[PDB]
Amino acid sequence: GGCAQICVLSHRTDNGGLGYRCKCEFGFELDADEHHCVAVKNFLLFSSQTAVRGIPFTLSTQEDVMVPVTGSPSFFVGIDFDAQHSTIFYSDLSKNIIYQQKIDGTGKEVITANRLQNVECLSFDWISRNLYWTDGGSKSVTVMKLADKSRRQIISNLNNPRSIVVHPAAGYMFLSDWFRPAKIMRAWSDGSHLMPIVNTSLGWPNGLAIDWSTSRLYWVDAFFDKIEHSNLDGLDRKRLGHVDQMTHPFGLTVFKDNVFLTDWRLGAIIRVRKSDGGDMTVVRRGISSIMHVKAYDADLQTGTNYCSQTTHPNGDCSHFCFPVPNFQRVCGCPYGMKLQRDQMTCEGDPAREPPTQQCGSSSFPCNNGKCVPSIFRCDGVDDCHDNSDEHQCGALNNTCSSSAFTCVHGGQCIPG
């Protein structure tokens, strides 16, 4: 049909009597001639109990831009994106795993499955290619480097941390804690400094967003039901007008002249203007347990910093490179390691940070970096989603669980 990617039948009278139309595969979009395809720049992402999926910003079109992410069971909460590889990162609480996946559905990989309890926010730094997440069970903020899969925990002893956003150009990290007294906190990328930038008149600061056209910070509060925005020092502060039915906001993002918001009580996505509020538009309704909203933008992830310069890569740091304010870099080492006089380089620290075993005593270590109770080892079902636990069981080397049932001739075990 002269189409670049896909040709689909229409009514015989449609398209001037040609009877066909052209469509582009996931991750692609249609161009002015309605025949050729171009790669998507802008689309919105949102997460919910059942699914993580993305939709276009033009409300005239309401068909998904990416292959939806869904599994059995599912409870998605935290999401971020990587544009240079057409990838999204998502966290699942029903499995306590963080995954990376491609918007065409062709790839799925596990970032980590180890020592995640209540992860309910992900942030991604694209100059250094670092991933940050918040956990409310361990009450901590953790950072990982994806090339080496190197892990360090940089903030601890928080009360109820919820949301984290990272700014690579400014070298700042922002965090929110909603245990009374609630606070919004600023840190450096390595977590070396930490200070509350907002602690007055905050009840439930559930969500944070960054505005890049102005270098400003936005937060939404569910106790007082308000949207506020400030400058990154917290010293200039303004409040947007009353949103019509917003009564328990949770998630926030900012794109061009608009601010996008999610409400639990409505189970809805709302769009208003970031300067004033108002002009309420409802993008979706009836979403079962809607959690987070995030904006995919390839242009946002353009940039350079001292960690990314081609003539001296990774800031000469061996493991971690962190941007910090006033356009300069810092180096870090993973958990089992220490820094050397030339801070570029790392060494091993068995004194202060010895090695640790994967899962402790009363659990089975699964090959994907996950821990499950010993009773589950051969109960007949894949309690570890790599199917590690049910591997080579019923054989003479591994007898089966008392909860399971065993097949007499076969020596294979099935749930009771």
Binding site: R180, P181, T200, S201, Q245, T247
Partner: protein, 106 residues
């Protein structure tokens, strides 16, 4: 149970014919008569039934002031919970909720 609930469970609507809604005291009824909804949803900021009757007849904030179960901040004219006044933490912009007039907890 199907004889009158709200759904036409058979073709001609023999069920739901001639009913009068009689929901219990734990619920609220809406002005045009179409729906009854639990009490928690009355006066919650969300229009839970058509014609907005669940939110129409609701208390409002007096002009420039706060409810008797609230506290007001001198520096910003904003309302916070009564408990927040004098609990060691400055909630107001100027921290006026932690004034010198309060007494300790042993």
């Amino acid at each position: 149970l199907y004889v009158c609930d709200g759904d036409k469970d058979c073709v001609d609507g023999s069920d739901e014919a001639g009913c009068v809604l009689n929901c219990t005291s734990s619920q609220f009824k809406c002005a045009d008569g179409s729906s009854c909804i639990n009490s928690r949803y009355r006066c919650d900021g969300v229009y839970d039934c058509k014609d907005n009757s669940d939110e129409a007849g609701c208390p409002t904030r007096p002009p420039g002031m706060c409810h008797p179960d609230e506290f007001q901040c001198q520096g910003d004219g904003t309302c916070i919970p009564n408990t927040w006044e004098c609990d060691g933490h400055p909630d107001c912009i100027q921290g006026s909720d932690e004034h010198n007039g309060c007494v300790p907890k042993t």
